[PDB]
Design a protein around this ligand. Structure first.
Ligand SMILES: OC[C@H]1O[C@@H](SCCc2ccccc2)[C@H](O)[C@@H](O)[C@H]1O
Ligand SMILES: OC[C@H]1O[C@@H](SCCc2ccccc2)[C@H](O)[C@@H](O)[C@H]1O
Ligand SMILES: [Mg+2]
Lengths: 416, 208
């Protein structure tokens, strides 16, 4: 479809109904959205949980919203209000929204080292106490900000032990199940990884729940990649494609913005630098100021990124390509004017017998404060299973299905 | 006059050095010495400010960092805004310098001393907040058979825009001539005149 032009990721090209199908029944008067935000004092000893709830259906005076916060079986905080937001402009406010503020003293903070979670329950009920519907999510108290050129979590500078991960199974293709996801998370933590990049599209919704519960930092990425265009920004600099790109970014943010594990948004991958990227960078900063935005295209340090995020830049050696040079990472930091942190969105290509010189990255990460780590390329080999004459299974790669043209063994870049 | 006519850039330096004090800023943090220090800085600027070869002023050398240095940095910026001011004391990157100007920082290796660390020059550039150019006011101590690793500085100077070079330590050996019994001249150094205590051959650091 014309959507295929924006989905040129380096992976097997497959098709079908490849994630879950479900029916949901809601009442006519219903919770239609809710957002959860957390703010702290200077030393993280007091928090405010702010919850915005929106409804659809017929507004009545007897409608009430209660938000409560649970730690295990203990209720920690609670708030109740009728609908009607504060005045926003000359025409009034939102009659169909309400904002509750809940104080929490000495909250337990979420991080990848200690993933402390609370449970938030949102109830739409009548003034006399009859429940209409309830919704809930997991809440992690943490703060992510960039200050004086460093990415900070809960006021401390992060060092990202990251990997890129594709959704791939050798028998089921691009169908992910829970058992496979849990197996990948345990192996990552057991090998001292603390972070994962969704390369290069939003994942199955259960993935973010597991990263919240076990403790991994997530970069969540929009489904936009136009690598095979000439030049690479032919579509992302055209205003006729601004509609199609904006649906890919705005719907990801509206789905995933309540997950504590998501710490950074990404505008996609390898689509050059176009005015459409600047427009969408600014849209996210305005609706969700609580997470940085990163984007690598157009030379990794454009006005559409908060973090310098090169791919495959070397530690000591410059690669001076026209228009989009890859400086050595130690030199990139100190270019005239540059103040941002540097985190490699892809480094150390693990294809076959590889990772030579890995120690040289980790020596530099530990010595320079503004080098805050990176995501290895990548987690798992994308090989598929074929059968010989005797029905014995074997591992197959590009070109083994009569597919042509193909990129042969470039689909196998995994650490596992 | 000769540097104007032949063409050399000059850093002109005030006659202030209090290296042997403990701590090094005992006098330059005292307001009773602010008068004596200000005559050394203000009279140099009134003498030399018309020379084209002078491109940078310096507040002196190795006197720690005191409030007297900040006062005099600001005096020069106000009377002569046409040249940058540099000063190395107190860790080479204080509020009294326009240029980061370490002495003997290494290319790749950090030397983390308490209060006044010498970072590697490539790392110093990129510390959170840092925007100034870096020019080493002394590097590559040429004492005796020396200058090993000189190529490693020049590789870094050419690759990083904000590393803009440095001043070797130093031009000429400070040896004096003595005479033996037959009246033959010989080159003498610290301690050869009955001077005590002395620092022996540390007076010979020259390229010539
Ligand atoms: O795993 C392959 C990698 O290929 C390079 S393109 C340059 C290499 C290439 C180009 C065309 C065909 C095969 C390889 C990408 O930048 C990486 O993100 C990754 O996808
Ligand atoms: O040429 C000697 C050099 O000595 C060192 S002090 C550390 C070395 C030292 C200390 C005491 C006595 C002898 C040497 C200075 O920082 C340099 O400017 C230069 O004067
Ligand atoms: Mg690609």
């Amino acid at each position: 479809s014309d959507g295929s032009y924006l989905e040129d990721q380096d992976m097997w090209r497959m098709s079908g109904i490849f994630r879950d199908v479900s029916l949901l029944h809601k009442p006519t008067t219903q919770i239609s959205d809710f957002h959860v935000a957390t703010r702290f004092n200077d030393d993280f000893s007091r928090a405010v949980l702010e919850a915005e709830v929106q409804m659809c259906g017929e507004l009545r005076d007897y409608l009430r919203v209660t938000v409560s916060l649970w730690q295990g079986e203990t209720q920690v905080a609670s708030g109740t209000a009728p609908f009607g937001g504060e005045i926003i402009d000359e025409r009034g406010g939102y009659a169909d929204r309400v904002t509750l503020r809940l104080n929490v003293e000495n909250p337990k903070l979420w991080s990848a080292e200690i993933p402390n979670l609370y449970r938030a329950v949102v109830e739409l009920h009548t003034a006399d106490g009859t429940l209409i519907e309830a919704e809930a999510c997991d809440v992690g108290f943490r703060e992510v900000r960039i200050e004086n050129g460093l990415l900070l979590l809960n006021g401390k500078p992060l060092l990202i032990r990251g990997v890129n991960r594709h959704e791939h199974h050798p028998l089921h293709g691009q169908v992910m199940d829970e058992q496979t996801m849990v197996q990948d998370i345990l192996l990552m933590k057991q090998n001292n990884f603390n972070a994962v990049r969704c390369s290069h599209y939003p994942n199955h919704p259960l993935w973010y729940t597991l990263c919240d519960r076990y403790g991994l930092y997530v970069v969540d990425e929009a489904n936009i990649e136009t690598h095979g265009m000439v030049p690479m920004n032919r579509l992302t600099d055209d205003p006729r494609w601004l509609p199609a790109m904006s649906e890919r970014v705005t719907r990801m943010v509206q789905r995933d913005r309540n997950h504590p594990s998501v710490i950074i948004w990404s505008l996609g991958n390898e689509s050059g630098h176009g005015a459409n990227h600047d427009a969408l960078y600014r849209w996210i900063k305005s609706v969700d100021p609580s997470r940085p935005v990163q984007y690598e295209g157009g030379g990794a340090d454009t006005t559409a990124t908060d973090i310098i995020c090169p791919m495959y830049a070397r530690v000591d050696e410059d690669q001076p390509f026209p228009a989009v040079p890859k400086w050595s990472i130690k030199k990139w930091l100190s270019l005239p004017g540059e103040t941002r942190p540097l985190i490699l969105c892809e480094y150390a290509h693990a294809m076959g017998n590889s990772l030579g010189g890995f120690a040289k990255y980790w020596q530099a990460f530990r010595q320079y404060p503004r080098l805050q780590g990176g995501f290895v390329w990548d987690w798992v080999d994308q090989s598929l299973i074929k059968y010989d004459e005797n029905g014995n299974p074997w591992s197959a790669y590009g070109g083994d299905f009569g597919d042509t043209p193909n990129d042969r063994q470039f689909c196998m870049n995994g650490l596992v």
